[PDB]
Ligand code: HEM
């Protein structure tokens with residue numbers, strides 16, 4: 001289920017984080033707009049950059065914290081607020097997040113492993129909803 005998936009991802013968080021973010025970037029090329037430093041680089045090139053691995057993991061670490069504090073895949077309002085208020089999220093809208101989780105759910109489904117995809121799909125939708133309630137456009 002969801003709780004076990006959190007453990008699966010945390011277990012090899014660096015690898016999963018990179019794979020899923022890369023799936024995101026490749027599914028939605030315009031999204032690289034929020035990432036000028038990743039432009040014009042293959043997946044393997046990106047993985048060779050120190051900040052790519054470091055940032056992607058720190059992103060997914062916070063995502064797993066938010067996921068774990070959730071109740072029935074509903075994130076805490078305060079976690080949503082944190083994500084809205086982060087300086088690094090200045091220019092973002094809920095659409096950026098919607099797309100991230102569409103990619104994440106697609107990755108899970110295509111994976112050999114028994115991820116609870118429906119739960120992550122709900123988590124993504126409920127996070128988007130919470131981001132909106134916490135004031136993200
Ligand atoms: C639940 C989903 C997300 C979580 C938990 C999250 C968390 C974080 C964290 C912890 C950082 C700081 C990383 C660091 O400084 O090392 C960060 C930075 C950043 N995030 Fe988010 N993030 C999420 C979704 C997104 C999405 C969907 C986008 C855009 C599509 C985005 C855009 C950025 C940008 C532009 C930065 C600063 C530059 C960079 O680190 O590449 N974030 N995020």
Ligand SMILES: O=[N+]([O-])c1ccc(O)cc1
Nearest residue numbers: 021024052055056059100
């Ligand atoms: O998955 N994400 O949204 C990310 C991943 C890496 C990063 O540096 C910023 C955002």
